Amino acid sequence: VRTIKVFTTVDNINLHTQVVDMSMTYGQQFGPTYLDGADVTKIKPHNSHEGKTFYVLPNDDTLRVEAFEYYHTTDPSFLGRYMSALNHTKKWKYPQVNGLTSIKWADNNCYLATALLTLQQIELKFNPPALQDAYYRARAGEAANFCALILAYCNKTVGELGDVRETMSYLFQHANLDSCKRVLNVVCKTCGQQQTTLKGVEAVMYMGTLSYEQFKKGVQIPCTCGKQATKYLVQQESPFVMMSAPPAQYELKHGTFTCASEYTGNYQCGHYKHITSKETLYCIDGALLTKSSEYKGPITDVFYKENSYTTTI
């Protein structure tokens, strides 16, 4: 019987040589099989498949350990969702706008492009080797495998609308933000004063205000005794801070922030645009670049740089 030899893997770095029967589909010999994202499960082997690398699912205990060491996940449907997203993201265009790698618009990838542009402006270190390698190639322009991993880690599908803030929280869980720490103090005239301390992902993000300076001076917050308490940032140890709020009209000044996310649309249905501060105020809409001196628009997320801050109160 005429046969061929292909390579099966779960991480593309540990290849396993397998012989294939050209009269049996890949689904009968290895189960769900993928070739560069293309589902070749119900396809009989071709002569052109000689020596190529095929993605398979972790069926034995050896591949389950190989998969976790690379992706840091035990989800059996991860590679299926990752290969499915890779089939679309490999056909996307990743131009270099303002020295950053963005995505030309396709299949409603506005939140993915806005997220990819933000990660290239913050100091973040991923723990899964899959994200580390893909991010290293995403900066050079090869962001197809990286964007597919983002959809897989977020349980999102190509064409599904997503939130930039929710995409960050999903990716920050796979980052090394353990050294980050935040100290907060909420003061109330009635019940009193109490200091809280946050660490990790919670010490980086905040929902309520877009101004980092107003976070230091204090922001009004409700209380159990029915009084508007004031919460101010006491101490912050992190390479960056993420300030989030519902999309409202906000003014961006030069040098006071790193990058911002613009959201125009209703809840669960809108358009995302990325705004960065460099030589002036730039606005990136996928492959579209727009320079401006000052900006004013519907802002939902603002990102700042930080080392170590301690308030003086």
State the binding site.
188, 191, 223, 225
Question: Which residues fall in the annotated binding site for Zn(2+)?
Answer: 188, 191, 223, 225
Compare residues 128 and 162 and give the one whose CB is closer to ligand Y3R: 162
∠ CA 278-280-286 to the nearest 5 degrees? 70
Give me 264's structure tokens: 């125009």
- Of 44-52, 162-170, 194-202, 210-218: span binding ligand Y3R (CB under 6 A): 162-170
Give me 273's structure tokens: 């645009």
Q: How far is the CB of 154 from Cl ion (least distance, A)?
A: 17
Q: How far is the CB of 198 from ligand Y3R (least distance, A)?
A: 19
Q: What are the Cα distances from residue 36, in Å, to 12, 80, 91, 145?
A: 10, 12, 11, 10
Among 108, 127, 157, 169, binds ligand Y3R (CB under 6 A): 108
State the binding partner of 52 from ligand Y3R, Cl ion, Zn ion, none, CB within 5 to 8 A by kind: none
Contact yes or no for 150/31 (Cβ under 8 A): no
The residues binding Cl ion (CB under 5 A) are 125-126, 132, 135
228 phi-psi bin (left φ>0, alpha ψ -120 to 50, beta other)? beta
Phi–psi pair at 28, nearest 5 degrees: -85, -25
The residues binding Zn ion (CB under 5 A) are 188, 190-191, 223, 225, 227
Q: How far is the CB of 134 from Cl ion (least distance, A)?
A: 9
State the binding partner of 166 from Zn ion, Cl ion, ligand Y3R, none, CB within 5 to 8 A by kind: ligand Y3R
> Which residues are bridge partners to 250 per DSSP?
297
Please give the Cα distance from 157 to 89 (Å, whole number): 11
Among 10, 300, 302, 303, binds ligand Y3R (CB under 6 A): 300
User: How many residues bind to ligand Y3R according to rule CB under 6 A?
Assistant: 18
State the binding partner of 249 from Cl ion, ligand Y3R, Zn ion, none, CB within 5 to 8 A by kind: none
The closest of 175, 193, 170 to 313, measured between CA atoms, is: 193
The closest of 232, 219, 255 to 310, measured between CA atoms, is: 232
Q: Among all residues, which ones are annotated catalytic?
A: 110, 271, 285
Q: How far is the CB of 137 from Cl ion (least distance, A)?
A: 11
State the binding partner of 84 from ligand Y3R, Cl ion, Zn ion, none, CB within 5 to 8 A by kind: none
User: What b/e string do you get for 252-285 counting C-beta neighbours within 10 Å, with b at 16 or more?
Assistant: beeeebbbbbbbeeeeeebbbbbbbbeeebbbbb
Q: How far is the CB of 195 from Zn ion (least distance, A)?
A: 14
163 makes contact with ligand Y3R (CB under 6 A): yes
Q: How far is the CB of 273 from ligand Y3R (least distance, A)?
A: 9
State the binding partner of 126 from Zn ion, Cl ion, ligand Y3R, none, CB within 5 to 8 A by kind: Cl ion
Tokens 């204090």 locate to 218
Among 4, 43, 161, 187, binds ligand Y3R (CB under 6 A): 161
222 makes contact with ligand Y3R (CB under 6 A): no
Please give the Cα distance from 242 to 144 (Å, whole number): 26
Please give the Cα distance from 276 to 274 (Å, whole number): 7
Residues in contact with ligand Y3R by CB under 6 A are 108, 110-111, 161-163, 166, 246-247, 263, 265, 267-272, 300
